[PDB]
Design a protein around this ligand. Structure first.
Ligand SMILES: C[C@H](CCC(=O)NCCC[N+](C)(C)C[C@H](O)CS(=O)(=O)O)[C@H]1CC[C@H]2[C@@H]3[C@H](O)C[C@@H]4C[C@H](O)CC[C@]4(C)[C@H]3C[C@H](O)[C@]12C
Ligand SMILES: Nc1nc2c(ncn2[C@@H]2O[C@H](COP(=O)(O)OP(=O)(O)O)[C@@H](OP(=O)(O)OP(=O)(O)O)[C@H]2O)c(=O)[nH]1
Ligand SMILES: Nc1nc2c(ncn2[C@@H]2O[C@H](COP(=O)(O)OP(=O)(O)O)[C@@H](OP(=O)(O)OP(=O)(O)O)[C@H]2O)c(=O)[nH]1
Ligand SMILES: [Mg+2]
Ligand SMILES: [Zn+2]
Ligand SMILES: [Zn+2]
Lengths: 76, 50, 49, 49, 38, 99, 50, 98, 151, 142, 923
C-alpha cells in the first residue's frame, strides 16, 4: 500500500491517529520484539504496518489487547 | 559653468557663460517666469528629462 | 540631476481640491538651496534651503 | 556561442516545458565543453604552538 | 530535561538578580593580550 | 548541493550555509505554514530542533541512526535558550514554571 | 541536433527566432551547395560564377 | 490653538504628514539637531512615516495605523512639552556646558 | 550569568521611554517632570511634613535652596533616580487603591469617573501580580554569559 | 461610413428644414435614439471585455510573461475605465433630453449648433465657452 | 509541476529527508504525492494535463472531412489501433465502431452495454485507456483542456482515487506519444495576415482625416478630437482582430468526393490556440493582426497606433512605444507579488490558531443557502454552493411532512443529485461562523471539503488552511485597483419589467392598494417580485420601487416577455389610500410655497421651500396635505386612527389641487428624484485587502434603529434631523443627517428597524449591529467572492467564513453583573460566564453583550499569549506590559509551540496535547 493510504483511512477515519497507530506498530516491528503478520515483499516496516492496518488485523484496540496479553504472559 | 549654462538656457538668454554667483536681475527674471507658468504661458519641467 | 534651476509642480495631491501649487528651486553644485513656492492662497513664499 | 540544427516539434515530452533535448552528437564533437581555471591557495601561518 | 509548561514573566527583583549570578565583574579587562587566557 | 552533517556556528548553533562550507538549506516561515496545513507535527518538530539547534538531540539521533533505531529526543531549541538568556540579561524574570 | 518545443513560440511573442531558423537553414543550404561543388573540384570559374 | 493642533488633526485626517510640515510647524526652540526624533516617533504611533517628498499609492497605511495603540499619553506629553518651551536639552553635553 | 553592583541607582529605560510611561502613570507624574528629575535639574519633595509643599512637587535649584535655608530639618527632598526609587518605595498601593474606591463611591462625573476606574484597575493589576514598584529601578545589573558575546 | 457615432445607429445625418424650429419632437427622438444605441453598445462591449478577462486569467510560472499577460490587460482596463466615465455623461445627456433642456450652452444661453451636436452629441457648451473652459482646466491641472 | 508553479528554465528545488519512523509515516500518509490530487481551495483536481499532453490528445480526437477509411466498420478499439499502426487508416477519420461501456446501475455493479457508436479512430484508441465506469460520451467529443479536466473530474467522482491516479498517468503517456507522432510545429507562413487588413486601415485613416477636417472647421476643441480618434482606432483594432480570426479558424475548404465543404482548420498555431495549451486570441492577434493602441507613461493613450504585426516588422517609433508599455508592466509585476505576500501573511496571522477541537457542538442555527438567482437566470446554482456542507435541519419536499434529508447529514454528490430531482430552493446549512463550540470549531459545522473526500477529521488546523487557500491566489488579480461600471446584465431598463420565462407571478413583502381601474399599486419600500416555474421553483426575481403601477397582479400566468410593471424612474408618486378631496394645510404663499398654478386641467408646480428659502415666520410650519372627506372630518387610514397627513417634502409638484375627488390610489403629487442608477463594478487586489480591513466606506448609507413613525426636526442647521418614534417603545431617538442625504421614506411613515433610509454603501459595522451576524457574514462573503470570480479564481466560501469568524472574535458588554461593564472581551469568555449564570441559580445580571467587528489587523493584535505577540508585534511593548502584569503563558497555540520547539497541537500532535490535558488535574 505504498501508493495511497486511502483505504486505511476508510478503516480508521481520523487519518491522524492512523499514522500514530502505524508508528507504534512499526516501531514494535523494527525493534524485533515481534514479527510481521504479512508475507514480506522485501518492504520496510512502514508499508508493512500500513498493509497490516488495511486488512483489519491491527488497530488501537487490537494493539492494546495483544499488548496486555504479552504483558500478562511475561509476568508469569 | 554647467549650472550657469542651465540657468541661462532655462530663461532663454543667448548668453552662455556668466559669473557663477547669482546676480539678482536673474532672480527677478526667475520670479517673472514662475508667475508666467502660474498664469499658464509655458510648460513645467519634469525632473526626469535627460 | 545637474545643478541649476528647476520648476516643479507637485500637482494633484495639493489639498484634494486641485490648487496646483508651483515652485522654483535653485540648486548650486555645493551650497545651500533657494526655494520660491506658492500656497493655496496664491502667496509667494521663500524658503532657505 | 555556436549554431546548432534545431527542429521545432514535441518529442515524447522530454522538451515538455522550456527544457531542451540534445543529441549525443553534440557532446561527441566536444563543441560545448568549457575550460575552467580555478585557483586554490594554501597559506601556512605560525600559531603560538 | 524537564517537561514544562506555563512560562512566567515578571520584573526581576535585585535579590533574584544576585541569585542567578555566580560572581561580580569588577574590572573591564577582557584578556591578557600576551597569553590570551582570561 | 547536498549536506548530511557538518560544521556549526559559534553563537547560534545552526549549520553554516554556503558552498565552501557544506551548506545546509533553510526551512522558512512559509514552509512552516505549509507543514502546519498538513497534520504533520513530528516532521516539523524534528526539522525545527533535532535537525538544527538541539546539540544533545542531534548527537543522540546520529547514534540512533547508526544503531538502526529511529526514535527522537527533542530537547529545547538553542535559539530559545539564547532568548531566555537575553531577556534575563534585562531586568525581566522569565522562568519555566512547573505544576 | 536539438529538438525545441513548439508550444513556446506563440505565447512567447518572440517570433524572430523562427525567421532566424529559416534564414540560417538557407545559409547552410548555400554552404552545402558550395561544399558539393568543391568536393568534385569543378573549376575556379564555376565557383566564381555561383 | 497652537502650531500643532492643526497638525495632529491632519496626520490622521489625511493619512500622513510630509516632512515639510513637521519642519516649519515647530515653535522656535527645541530645533536642536534632531530634537524632532521624539515628536516624529510619537506621530509615528499614529501612522505617518512619510517618504522623501510625500509620495502615494499603496492602500496599506491603516494596518500600521492600527498597529500603533489607543493609549495616547504621547498626545498629552507632546502638548505639554511643546506648550512650555523648556529647552529639551537631552544631550548631556549642553546641560554640563551650562 | 554575572552581575555588577551599581553605585548610583539607575532607572530602567523601558519603563520610562515606552510610549505609555508606566512609572509616570503609576506615580501620576508627567514624563517631562521625571526627565527633569533624573537629569538633576530640579528636586522633588519626599514627604514634606507639615509644610507648604506637596509630596510630588518639583522644586527648582534656588527654590530648593531658599527652602532648605528656611526649612533645614523636617524637610526631605532629593534628586535623581534614587529620589524616584525612594518615593516609589514609600507609596502604599493597597491603601491608595482603597482611597480610589472611596472616591468611586463618592465621585459622580462621567470622564473623571472613567479615569478613576482606569487607575483603579491599573493599581489592582499591579498589586495582584505581586511586583513591588521599586524594582523598576535597577540596583544590580546582570551580565550576559560570555559565550553569547564572544571574543 | 460604419465607424462614426451616427453609423452605430441606422440613422443618417439630419437636415434642418427651412422654417423648422430648433428643438422639435423629431430631433429629440433622433438624439435619444443615438444616445441609447451608443450606451447599449458600450455596455455590451464591457460584457465582452469582462468575459475575456475571466477566461484568460491564469497563474504563469515565468515572471517575464506574467508581465506580458498583464500589460495588455492594463490598457484594456484603461479603456474600460474611460468608457465607464463616459457612461455617466451619456446618462446625464439623456436626462437633459428627457427634461427638454437639450441643445443650449450651459455657460451662455446661446444654442449649440446642430452639426456640433451630431459631431459630439454629449456637447454641453458652445465652442467658445468650451475652449475657454479647456484653457482654465489645463491651467489648473498642469 | 502545476502544483509547484515550477518551470524548467533553471529553477531549483530542495529535498529534505524525514528521519524518524513517525516522520516517515507522516510523509507517506498525509504528504504523499498520490494522496493530494485535489486542490484545497476547491474540490476539483490539480494534476490536470498542462500543455503538451492536451495538444496530443486534441490532435488525437479531432475529426476530419475526408481521410483514409471513411465509413469502415471495426469490431472494436483494438482493431482500430491495429489499423492505425499499420498505416491503413488516418489517425482521425469518421468511423463506426462497436464499444462496450460499463454502467454503475445497481449498488456498485458494472453492467456492460455493447453497441455501435459513430466516432473517430483516434477516439477509440483513446477509449482503450478509459477505466470501466466511465460513459463513452466523455471521449466522443473534441477533447480539449476543459473536456479533459472534466474527464478526470468525473473519473474521480465515480470510481475513486486509485483509478483516477492510474488514468491520469495513462493520459500523460498516451498524450506525449501521440503528440510526438503528430509532428506539430510552427512556420512563418502558418500565421496568415487577413486579406482585408489594409482595407480597414485605410477606412480608419480616412475617418481620422474627416475628423481633422471637421476640427479645422471649428465644431470640436482638441479634446473631442483626441477622444474621438482614440475610439475610432479602438473599433478598427477589434474589427481587424475579428476579421483575422474569421480568416484563420475555418479556412480549410477541403473537398469531399465531388463538391467541397469547409471545416475546422488544421493550422498548427490555431490548434495550439484552441486546445488551450498555449496562446489566446489576443496573442494570435498580436502576431497576425494589428497590435492595437498603446499607452505612454502617464496612463494616457497615444493617438497614433502601431498597425504593424510581428510577422511584418515594426520601426523605431513603434518599438519605442512598445518599450514604454512593456517595461512599465515588468516593473509593476515584482512589487505586486511582494505585496501579495504581505496580504497573505497578515491573513495568516489572524487565523493561525483556529483548530477543529470538538466533534459536534449541537447547534440548531444555520445560514440560508439559496441559488443566487440574480434576475434573469441562476448566475451560480445551488449545488455548487451547498456541496459538502452539513444540514442544520430537515428539508421537506414541496409537500409538508415528507422529510427527504434527515437532520445533520453530510451532503455528498448523490444527495445533491436527489436534491436536484426535487425543486427545493433554500436550505439551512450549519456554518463555521455560527458554530457554538468555544476555542475552535466542531467537525460538522465545517464539512468535508479538502484534498481528501470525507468529513473533516478531528484535529486538523483549519485556520491556516483557509488562510493559505485565500492567499495562494491573488496573483491573477490585477495589481492596481480598476473600475468597470458596466453591469452588463441590468434590468433592460429602469422603468418596465420584462419577464423572461413563462411562470406564475409571486410577490414578497408588499401591501398593495387597489386603484380605480383596479391595479395593485405597491406602497411598500421593501417589495420583491419573484416568478415560480413549472415545477415550483424561483426562476425570475425583480425589484419594484415604491409607487409603481402594476398591470397583472398575483397568480395569473404571464407569457414570455410581457411588461408586467411600469413607472418613471426619477419620480416618486405619493399614493392615496382613501378617496375624496385634498385639503391644503399650512401652504401659505410666500411663507412656505411659491404659487405656480395652471389653468383648467388643474396643474401646479408648487415648491415646498425649506427653512432657508422659507421666510422668517414659516420656520416650524410643516405644510401638509390634509385627507378630508366630503363632510370635512379627517378620514382615517384603514384600520388605524392616523389621518394620513402627507408632509410634502421640498419640490413636491402637487398636480391634483384642492377640488379633485381623489380615487383610492391616485397619485397626489409627483416629486422628481434623479437618483444615480448604476452599480459600478470594483475589483483587483487592494480592494480585497480593503474589504478585509473593514474600513467604513465613503458617504455611507444610513439605516433605521427602532421602528415607528418617523419625523423631522430642527430645521436647516446643516444637517436635517430624523426622529424615529416607536409606536410602542419610547420616542426619543434623534439622528442628525446631512442635507445632501436623499431620503427614501416620507416623514409621516412607520419604518421598521434596519431598512435603508438613504442610498449608497452600507458600512459592515452597521450591518452587524442592526441586522446581526448572519447578515454581515453573508455581505462580506458575497462582496469579496464577487471580486475573486471577476478574475475567474474559484474559492469555496468556507475559508472566507472562518476568516469572518476571526473578525467577530470580540464583543462589548453593556449590562453588568461580573465584568467591568465596558471592557472589550472575547465572546467565548462571555458565553461561558453566561452558561455559568444560567446553569447556576443567579443571573449576575445579566450580562447582555453586543458583537464588534474588527479588521484582520486589530484582530491579530488581540492575541492572548505574549510569545506570539512578541514574535510579530513590537516586542519591546508586549514584553514590558507582560513583565509588569506578571502574565502567565500556557502557550496552548501553534506559533508558541513552534517557538519553543515542542509538538504543535494540530493534527498528529493533537493527541499528544489531548493526553497532557487528561494528565493535568488528574491522578
Ligand atoms: C571647463 C568646463 C567649461 C567649458 C566652457 O565653459 N566652454 C565655453 C566655450 C565658449 N565658446 C568658446 C564656445 C564661445 C561662446 O560659446 C560664444 S556663444 O555665446 O555661444 O555665441 C566646465 C563645465 C562643467 C564643469 C565641471 C562641473 O562643474 C563639475 C566640477 C565642478 C568643480 O567645482 C570643478 C570641477 C568640475 C569637474 C567642473 C569642471 C569644469 O569647470 C567644467 C567641465
Ligand atoms: N501511480 C501509478 N501507479 C501504478 C501505475 N501502474 C501500476 N501502479 C501501481 O503501483 C504499484 C506498484 O506495484 P509493483 O511495484 O509493480 O509491485 P512490487 O512493489 O511488488 O514490485 C502497484 O500497486 P500497489 O502498490 O500494489 O497498490 P497497493 O496494493 O500497494 O495498495 C501498481 O498497481 C501507474 O501507472 N501509475
Ligand atoms: N471613449 C470615450 N471617452 C470619452 C469620450 N468623451 C469623453 N470621454 C471620457 O469622459 C471623461 C469625462 O470627460 P470630461 O471631463 O467631461 O471632459 P470633456 O468635457 O472634454 O468631455 C473623460 O475622462 P478623462 O479622464 O478626462 O480622460 P483622460 O484625461 O484620461 O484622457 C473622457 O476620457 C468619448 O467620446 N469617448
Ligand atoms: Mg523558472
Ligand atoms: Zn457658451
Ligand atoms: Zn459546530
Amino acid at each position: 500500500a505504498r501508493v495511497t493510504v486511502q483505504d486505511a483511512v476508510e478503516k480508521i477515519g481520523n487519518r491522524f491517529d492512523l499514522v500514530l497507530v502505524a508508528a507504534r506498530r512499526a516501531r514494535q516491528m523494527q525493534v524485533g520484539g515481534k514479527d510481521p503478520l504479512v508475507p514480506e515483499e522485501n518492504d520496510k516496516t512502514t508499508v508493512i504496518a500500513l498493509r497490516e492496518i488495511e486488512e483489519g488485523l491491527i488497530n488501537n484496540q487490537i494493539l492494546d489487547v495483544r499488548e496486555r496479553q504479552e504483558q500478562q504472559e511475561q509476568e508469569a | 559653468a554647467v549650472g550657469r549654462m542651465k540657468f541661462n538656457r532655462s530663461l532663454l538668454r543667448e548668453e552662455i557663460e556668466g559669473s557663477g554667483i547669482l546676480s539678482k536681475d536673474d532672480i527677478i527674471d526667475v520670479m517673472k517666469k514662475l508667475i508666467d507658468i502660474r498664469n499658464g504661458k509655458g510648460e513645467v519641467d519634469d525632473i526626469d528629462h535627460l | 540631476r545637474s545643478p541649476g534651476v528647476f520648476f516643479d509642480s507637485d500637482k494633484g495631491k495639493t489639498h484634494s481640491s486641485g490648487k496646483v501649487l508651483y515652485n522654483a528651486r535653485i540648486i548650486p553644485y555645493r551650497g545651500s538651496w533657494l526655494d520660491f513656492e506658492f500656497d493655496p492662497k496664491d502667496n509667494l513664499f521663500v524658503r532657505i534651503d | 556561442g555556436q549554431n546548432m540544427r534545431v527542429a521545432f516539434m514535441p518529442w515524447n515530452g522530454y522538451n515538455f516545458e522550456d527544457s531542451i533535448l540534445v543529441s549525443e552528437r553534440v557532446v561527441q564533437e566536444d563543441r560545448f565543453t568549457t575550460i575552467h581555471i580555478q585557483e586554490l591557495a594554501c597559506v601556512s601561518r605560525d600559531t603560538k604552538l | 530535561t524537564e517537561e514544562f509548561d506555563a512560562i512566567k514573566i515578571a520584573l526581576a527583583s535585585p535579590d533574584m538578580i544576585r541569585s542567578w549570578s555566580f560572581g561580580e565583574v569588577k574590572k573591564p579587562e577582557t584578556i591578557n593580550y600576551r597569553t590570551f587566557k582570561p | 548541493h547536498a549536506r548530511s552533517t557538518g560544521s556549526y556556528s559559534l553563537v547560534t548553533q545552526q549549520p553554516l550555509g554556503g558552498k565552501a562550507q557544506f551548506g545546509g538549506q533553510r526551512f522558512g516561515e512559509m514552509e512552516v505554514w505549509a507543514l502546519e496545513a498538513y497534520g504533520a507535527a513530528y516532521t516539523l518538530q524534528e526539522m525545527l530542533t533535532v535537525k538544527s539547534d538541539d546539540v544533545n538531540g542531534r548527537t543522540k539521533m546520529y547514534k540512533n541512526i547508526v544503531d538502526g533505531n529511529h526514535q527522537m529526543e527533542p530537547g529545547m531549541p538553542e535559539s530559545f535558550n539564547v532568548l531566555l538568556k537575553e531577556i534575563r540579561s534585562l531586568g525581566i524574570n522569565i522562568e519555566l514554571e512547573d505544576e | 541536433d536539438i529538438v525545441l518545443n513548439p508550444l513556446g513560440v506563440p505565447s512567447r511573442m518572440n517570433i524572430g527566432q523562427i525567421l532566424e531558423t529559416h534564414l540560417g537553414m538557407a545559409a547552410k543550404g548555400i554552404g552545402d551547395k558550395i561544399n558539393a561543388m568543391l568536393k568534385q573540384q569543378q573549376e575556379v570559374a564555376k565557383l566564381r560564377e555561383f | 490653538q497652537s502650531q500643532l493642533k492643526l497638525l495632529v488633526t491632519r496626520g490622521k485626517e489625511q493619512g500622513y504628514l510630509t516632512y515639510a510640515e513637521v519642519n516649519d510647524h515647530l515653535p522656535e526652540d527645541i530645533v536642536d539637531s534632531d530634537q524632532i526624533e521624539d515628536i516624529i516617533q510619537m506621530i509615528n504611533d499614529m501612522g505617518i512615516q512619510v517618504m522623501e517628498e510625500a509620495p502615494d499609492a499603496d492602500d496599506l497605511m491603516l494596518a500600521e495605523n492600527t498597529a500603533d495603540e489607543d493609549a495616547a499619553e504621547a498626545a498629552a506629553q507632546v502638548l505639554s512639552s511643546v506648550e512650555s518651551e523648556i529647552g529639551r536639552t537631552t544631550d548631556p553635553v549642553r546641560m554640563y556646558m551650562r | 550569568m554575572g552581575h555588577i553592583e551599581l553605585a548610583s541607582p539607575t532607572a530602567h529605560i523601558w519603563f520610562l521611554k515606552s510610549l505609555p510611561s508606566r512609572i509616570g502613570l503609576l506615580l501620576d507624574m508627567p514624563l517631562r517632570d521625571i526627565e527633569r528629575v533624573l537629569y538633576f535639574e530640579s528636586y522633588v519633595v519626599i514627604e514634606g511634613g507639615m509644610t507648604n509643599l506637596e509630596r510630588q512637587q518639583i522644586l527648582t535649584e534656588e527654590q530648593y535652596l531658599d527652602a532648605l535655608e528656611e526649612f533645614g530639618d523636617e524637610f526631605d527632598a532629593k534628586m535623581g533616580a534614587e529620589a524616584i526609587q525612594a518615593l516609589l518605595k514609600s507609596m502604599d498601593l493597597e491603601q491608595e487603591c482603597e482611597q480610589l474606591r472611596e472616591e468611586l463611591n463618592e465621585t459622580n462625573s462621567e470622564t473623571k469617573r472613567k479615569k478613576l476606574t482606569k487607575r483603579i484597575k491599573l493599581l489592582e493589576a499591579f498589586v495582584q501580580s505581586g511586583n513591588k514598584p521599586e524594582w523598576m529601578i535597577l540596583t544590580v545589573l546582570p551580565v550576559l554569559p560570555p559565550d553569547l558575546r564572544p571574543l | 461610413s460604419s465607424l462614426s457615432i451616427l453609423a452605430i445607429a441606422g440613422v443618417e445625418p439630419y437636415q434642418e428644414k427651412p422654417g423648422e424650429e430648433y428643438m422639435n419632437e423629431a430631433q429629440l427622438a433622433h438624439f435619444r435614439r443615438i444616445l441609447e444605441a451608443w450606451r447599449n453598445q458600450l455596455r455590451d462591449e464591457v460584457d465582452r471585455t469582462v468575459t475575456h478577462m475571466q477566461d484568460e486569467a491564469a497563474n504563469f510560472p515565468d515572471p517575464v510573461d506574467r508581465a506580458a499577460q498583464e500589460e495588455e490587460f492594463s490598457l484594456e482596463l484603461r479603456n474600460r475605465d474611460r468608457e465607464r466615465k463616459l457612461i455617466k455623461k451619456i446618462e446625464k445627456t439623456l436626462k437633459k433630453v428627457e427634461d427638454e433642456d437639450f441643445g443650449y450652452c450651459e455657460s451662455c444661453g446661446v444654442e449649440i449648433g446642430i452639426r456640433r451636436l451630431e459631431a459630439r452629441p454629449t456637447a454641453d457648451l458652445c465652442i467658445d465657452c468650451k475652449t475657454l473652459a479647456e484653457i482654465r482646466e489645463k491651467q489648473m491641472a498642469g | 509541476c502545476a502544483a509547484y508553479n515550477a518551470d524548467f528554465d533553471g529553477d531549483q528545488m530542495a529535498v529534505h529527508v524525514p528521519l524518524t519512523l513517525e516522520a516517515q509515516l507522516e510523509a507517506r500518509a498525509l504528504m504523499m504525492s498520490t494522496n493530494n490530487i485535489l486542490s484545497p481551495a476547491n474540490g476539483e483536481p490539480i494534476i490536470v494535463p498542462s500543455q503538451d499532453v492536451v495538444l496530443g490528445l486534441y490532435y488525437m480526437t479531432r475529426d476530419c472531412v475526408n481521410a483514409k477509411g471513411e465509413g469502415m466498420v471495426l469490431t472494436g478499439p483494438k482493431e482500430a489501433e491495429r489499423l492505425y499502426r499499420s498505416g491503413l487508416a488516418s489517425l482521425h477519420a469518421r468511423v463506426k465502431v462497436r464499444i462496450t461501456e460499463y454502467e454503475k446501475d445497481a449498488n456498485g455493479e458494472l453492467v456492460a452495454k455493447t453497441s455501435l457508436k459513430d466516432t473517430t479512430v483516434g477516439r477509440a484508441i483513446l477509449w482503450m485507456i478509459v477505466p470501466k465506469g466511465l460513459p463513452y460520451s466523455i471521449v466522443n467529443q473534441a477533447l480539449g483542456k476543459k473536456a479533459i479536466s472534466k474527464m478526470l473530474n468525473t473519473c474521480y467522482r465515480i470510481l475513486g482515487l486509485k483509478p483516477t491516479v492510474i488514468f491520469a498517468d495513462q493520459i500523460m503517456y498516451t498524450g506525449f506519444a501521440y503528440a510526438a507522432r503528430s509532428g506539430a510545429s510552427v512556420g512563418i507562413d502558418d500565421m496568415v495576415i487577413p486579406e482585408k487588413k489594409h482595407e480597414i486601415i485605410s477606412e480608419a485613416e480616412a475617418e481620422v482625416a474627416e475628423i481633422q477636417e471637421q476640427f479645422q472647421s471649428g465644431l470640436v476643441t482638441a479634446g473631442e478630437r483626441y477622444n474621438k480618434v482614440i475610439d475610432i482606432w479602438a473599433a478598427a483594432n477589434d474589427r481587424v482582430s475579428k476579421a483575422m480570426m474569421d480568416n484563420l479558424q475555418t479556412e480549410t475548404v477541403i473537398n469531399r468526393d465531388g463538391q467541397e465543404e469547409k471545416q475546422v482548420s488544421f493550422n498548427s498555431i490555431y490548434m495550439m490556440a484552441d486546445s488551450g495549451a498555449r496562446g489566446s486570441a489576443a496573442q494570435i492577434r498580436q502576431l497576425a493582426g494589428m497590435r492595437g493602441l498603446m499607452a505612454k507613461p502617464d496612463g494616457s493613450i497615444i493617438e497614433t497606433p502601431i498597425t504593424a504585426n510581428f510577422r511584418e516588422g515594426l520601426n523605431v517609433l513603434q518599438y519605442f512605444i512598445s518599450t514604454h508599455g512593456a517595461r512599465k508592466g515588468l516593473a509593476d509585476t515584482a512589487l505586486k507579488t511582494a505585496n501579495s505576500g504581505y496580504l497573505t501573511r497578515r491573513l495568516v496571522d489572524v487565523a493561525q490558531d483556529l483548530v477543529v477541537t470538538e466533534d459536534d457542538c449541537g447547534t440548531h442555527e444555520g445560514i440560508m443557502m439559496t441559488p443566487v438567482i440574480e434576475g434573469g437566470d441562476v448566475k451560480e446554482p445551488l449545488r455548487d454552493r451547498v456541496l459538502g456542507r452539513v444540514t442544520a435541519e430537515d428539508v421537506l419536499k414541496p409537500g409538508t411532512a415528507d422529510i427527504l434529508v434527515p437532520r445533520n447529514t453530510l451532503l455528498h454528490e448523490q444527495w445533491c443529485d436527489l436534491l436536484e430531482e426535487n425543486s427545493v430552493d433554500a436550505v439551512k446549512v450549519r456554518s463555521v461562523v455560527s458554530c457554538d463550540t468555544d476555542f475552535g470549531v466542531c467537525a460538522h459545522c465545517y464539512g468535508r471539503d479538502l484534498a481528501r473526500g470525507h468529513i473533516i477529521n478531528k484535529g486538523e488546523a483549519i485556520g491556516v488552511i483557509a488562510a493559505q487557500s485565500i492567499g495562494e491566489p491573488g496573483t491573477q488579480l490585477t495589481m492596481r485597483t480598476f473600475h468597470i461600471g458596466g453591469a452588463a446584465s441590468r434590468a433592460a431598463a429602469e422603468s418596465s419589467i420584462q419577464v423572461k420565462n413563462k411562470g406564475s407571478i409571486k410577490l414578497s413583502n408588499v401591501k398593495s392598494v387597489v386603484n380605480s381601474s383596479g391595479k395593485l399599486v405597491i406602497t411598500s419600500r421593501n417589495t420583491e417580485l419573484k416568478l415560480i416555474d413549472e415545477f415550483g421553483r424561483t426562476k425570475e426575481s425583480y425589484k419594484v420601487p415604491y409607487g409603481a403601477v402594476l398591470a397583472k397582479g398575483d397568480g395569473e400566468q404571464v407569457a414570455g416577455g410581457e411588461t408586467v410593471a411600469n413607472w418613471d424612474p426619477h419620480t416618486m408618486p405619493v399614493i392615496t389610500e382613501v378617496s375624496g378631496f385634498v385639503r391644503f394645510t399650512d401652504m401659505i404663499d410666500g411663507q412656505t410655497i411659491t404659487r405656480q398654478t395652471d389653468e383648467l386641467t388643474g396643474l401646479s408646480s408648487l415648491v415646498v421651500l425649506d427653512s432657508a428659502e422659507r421666510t422668517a415666520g414659516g420656520k416650524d410650519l410643516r405644510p401638509a396635505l390634509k385627507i378630508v372627506d366630503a363632510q370635512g372630518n379627517d378620514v382615517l387610514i384603514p384600520g388605524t386612527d392616523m389621518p394620513a397627513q402627507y408632509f410634502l417634502p421640498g419640490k413636491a409638484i402637487v398636480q391634483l389641487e384642492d377640488g379633485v375627488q381623489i380615487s383610492s390610489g391616485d397619485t397626489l403629487a409627483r416629486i422628481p428624484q434623479e437618483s444615480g442608477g448604476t452599480k459600478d463594478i470594483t475589483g483587483g487586489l487592494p480592494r480585497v485587502a480593503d474589504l478585509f480591513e473593514a474600513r467604513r466606506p465613503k458617504e455611507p448609507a444610513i439605516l433605521a434603529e427602532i421602528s415607528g413613525i418617523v419625523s423631522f426636526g430642527k430645521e436647516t442647521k446643516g444637517k436635517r434631523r430624523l426622529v424615529i418614534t416607536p409606536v410602542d417603545g419610547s420616542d426619543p431617538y434623534e439622528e442628525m443627517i446631512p442635507k445632501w442625504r436623499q431620503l427614501n421614506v416620507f416623514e409621516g411613515e412607520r419604518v421598521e428597524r434596519g431598512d435603508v433610509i438613504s442610498d449608497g454603501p452600507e458600512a459592515p459595522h452597521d450591518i452587524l449591529r442592526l441586522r446581526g451576524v448572519h447578515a454581515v457574514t453573508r455581505y462580506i462573503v458575497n462582496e469579496v467572492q464577487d471580486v475573486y470570480r471577476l478574475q475567474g479564481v474559484k474559492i469555496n466560501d468556507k475559508h472566507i467564513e472562518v476568516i469572518v469568524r476571526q473578525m467577530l472574535r470580540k464583543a462589548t458588554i453593556v449590562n453588568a453583573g461580573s465584568s467591568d461593564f465596558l471592557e472589550g472581551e472575547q465572546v467565548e469568555y462571555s458565553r461561558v460566564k453566561i452558561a455559568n449564570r444560567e446553569l447556576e441559580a443567579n443571573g449576575k445580571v445579566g450580562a447582555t453583550y453586543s458583537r464588534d467587528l474588527l479588521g484582520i489587523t486589530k484582530a491579530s493584535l488581540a492575541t492572548e499569549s505574549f510569545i506570539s505577540a512578541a514574535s510579530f508585534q513590537e516586542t519591546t511593548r508586549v514584553l514590558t506590559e507582560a513583565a509588569v502584569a506578571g502574565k502567565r503563558d500556557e502557550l496552548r497555540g501553534l506559533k508558541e509551540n513552534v517557538i519553543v520547539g515542542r509538538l504543535i497541537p494540530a493534527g498528529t500532535g493533537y493527541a499528544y496535547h489531548q493526553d497532557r490535558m487528561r494528565r493535568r488535574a488528574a491522578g
